[PDB]
Point group: D2
């Protein structure tokens, strides 16, 4: 999928997680976020289109996806263990990763 659609998937599933009542809902949403974050790896955003594909700037951009991907990984373990509230808290906390990349690269 394109970067924009992967970002919409992240947005939409964050809201699903916030409103969720049970593990299954949170797991399903985190599963979708994991796939969107991994698929976003290949994208070059408009504001870096004039940089070389493996420039320093592109390395720093992609670092944020490593952080996000790691955070989703941990949140899904918590949800898998039935720690629904803790998985929800983890999802709220990773908004900072979203925000940090947007501040620099959106």
């Amino acid at each position: 999928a394109d970067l924009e659609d992967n970002m919409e998937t992240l947005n939409d599933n964050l809201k699903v997680i916030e409103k969720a009542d049970n593990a299954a809902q949170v797991k399903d949403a985190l599963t979708k976020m994991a796939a969107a974050a991994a698929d976003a790896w290949s994208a070059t955003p408009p504001k870096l289109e004039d940089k070389s594909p493996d420039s320093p700037e592109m390395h720093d951009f992609r670092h944020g996806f490593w952080i996000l991907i790691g955070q989703i990984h941990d949140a899904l373990h918590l949800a898998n263990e039935g720690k629904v509230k803790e998985a929800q808290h983890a999802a709220e906390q990773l908004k900072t990763t979203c925000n940090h990349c947007h501040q620099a690269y959106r």
Copy 2:
């Protein structure tokens, strides 16, 4: 790219890293491995073609990619710091991740 092509990219760049004698070669190779691992996320392996796309078995398959992605992340930091030998050691260590997924799913 398809799973087989991403796997060839991973395999080829691991060999580049082994033979490398400067940071740039190792960084470039790890960069390519990071992209191939992320792109592999969406693939259904032949052995699980008869399972639902977000079955338990497919969750367990994809878990190995989180591990691999994390290991590539750390190796690139070591290479970025000019610790070329230590980045090469990290690359050797992450073969265990490759091997473990292959044993269960190849």
Copy 3:
């Protein structure tokens, strides 16, 4: 050292990182935080003194140190790469981990 001494080390060095001008200052501070976080692992916090040493509650308490330790690890790589502002951002993101444990267990 006891938990309170390790907490003072964490608190003091977070402030050092905020006010730092160069990578060496940030690296030194993160180094100290890494040691304090690892040493804090063995502590029983006052509010869980009435629980068994390896109770579920104590497992959930120690999970926060895994998160903190991992965040310090990554921040030090950023500082080692000379990315002072990015290491400072990572340090600010650490506070969420600090705050979350305090809310639940202090």
Copy 4:
């Protein structure tokens, strides 16, 4: 505890995990390994006794503990999810980390 006691704890519990029949046995063993790895952070290994406690060499030594600690974290999630075999495999994958540090520093 001293480094040798922490190393014996790691070694003993790896063998417990290998022979284990159920999740509880594996979780208990991984719990003990987590504590030993964190406690090992403060130790100076004999072969670096002539280096300053926060020398470059000591930084490189301690990096291996970040790796080990992270791996134990993940293994315990797998055990917590009831994935006994997969937690056992993760414990076996740990040995690469053990071996790497031993080769350079033991």
